[PDB]
Amino acid sequence: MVEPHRHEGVFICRLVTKNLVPGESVYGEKRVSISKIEYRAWNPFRSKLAAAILGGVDQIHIKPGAKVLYLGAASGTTVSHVSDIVGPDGLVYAVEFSHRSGRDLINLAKKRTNIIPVIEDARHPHKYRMLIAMVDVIFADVAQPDQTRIVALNAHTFLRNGGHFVISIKANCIDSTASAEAVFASEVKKMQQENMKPQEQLTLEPYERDHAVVVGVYRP
C-alpha cells in the first residue's frame, strides 16, 4: 500500500517518491509498483530532506511544478527525489562544484529532463547567472561555514519574492567546538539583514546528530 503524504508529491509506503523514470534506479534504491505506478524508496539516513519530512517539518515548499535551486547537489541522490517531486513541469537546478560529483549529476540529467546540472561554485552566482531562471525554492546542503552567506547571495540573484529556503545546517561544520543550539541561533541571526525570515527549525532526530533544517521565506 502506497498513499499520499501530507506534502504533495511525497508518498508513504505505509517514504517514497513517484518515479519520474519508471524502471530506472538512480543509486541502487529499490522500488515498488502499484496497479502501473512505480515509486522509489527514499532513505532518511541518506537524505536530509527525507529525515526532515519524517521528523515532522511543517513545510518543504518543494512540490509538483516548483522550480528549485539546489545548492550542494553532490552525485544527485536527494536531487533525484526532488526531481520526482517537482515532476515534468518543475525544475531542479543542481549546483555542485566537484567535477567528479558533477559527472554523476550530468549523467543523471541525461535521463531526467527536469534536472539542470550547474557545475560551478555556489559562492559566485554571477558566474552562472545565465544558466538559471528565477526559482521558487532554494534548498541548501553545502556543509560550509559560510553557507548562510552563500544562500543569501543565491537568494538575491535567483529566488523569487515570496520564495522559500530550506537549509540544512550541520552545526559542527560551522563551528566544531560550539553548542549546536548556539550555532543554529547564530546562523538564524545572520538572515535578518538579507530579508530572509525563518519560519521553522527542527533537528534531524536519530538520522543525523546536531543537524538542523531551517525553513523560511525571502522577501515576503
Query: Is there binding between residue 98 and ligand MTA (CB under 6 A)?
Result: yes
Contact track, ligand MTA, 129-168, x by CB under 6 A: ------------xxxx------------------------
Residue 5 C-beta-side C-alpha neighbours within 13 Å: 24
Please tell me whether residue 43 binds ligand MTA under the rule CB under 6 A: no
Tell me: is residue 84 an annotated ligand-binding position: no
Question: Of 116 and 142, which has the nearer Cβ to ligand MTA?
Answer: 142
121 near ligand MTA (CB under 6 A) = yes
CB 95 within 8 A of CB 118: yes
Residues near 162 by Cβ (< 8 Å), separated by ≥ 6? Answer: 217, 218, 219, 220
User: How far is the C-alpha of 67 from the C-alpha of 86, rounded, in Å?
Assistant: 7
Examine residue 101 and tell whether it contacts ligand MTA (CB under 6 A).
Answer: yes
Strand locations in the chain (E): 3-4, 10-12, 16-18, 31-34, 37-41, 67-71, 91-95, 115-118, 135-140, 159-170, 196-203, 211-218
Whose Cβ is closer to ligand MTA: residue 152's or residue 217's? 152
Give CA–CA dist 6/34, Å, rounded: 19
CB of 203 to ligand MTA, least distance (A): 18
Shortest separation between residue 88's beta carbon and ligand MTA, angstroms: 25
∠ CA 162-67-17 to the nearest 5 degrees? 115
Q: Is residue 123 near ligand MTA by the rule CB under 6 A?
A: yes
Distance CA 93, CA 206 (A): 29
Q: How far is the CB of 95 from ligand MTA (least distance, A)?
A: 5
For the bound state, the minimum distance from the C-beta of residue 148 to ligand MTA, rounded and expressed in Å, comes to: 13
User: Quick one: DSSP state of residue 130?
Assistant: G
Task: Choose among ligand MTA, Ca ion, none what residue 113 binds, the Cβ cut-off being 5 to 8 Å by kind.
Answer: Ca ion
Report the interface residues with Ca ion, using CB under 5 A. 113
> Would you tell me which residues interact with ligand MTA (CB under 6 A)?
72, 74, 95-98, 101, 121-123, 141-144
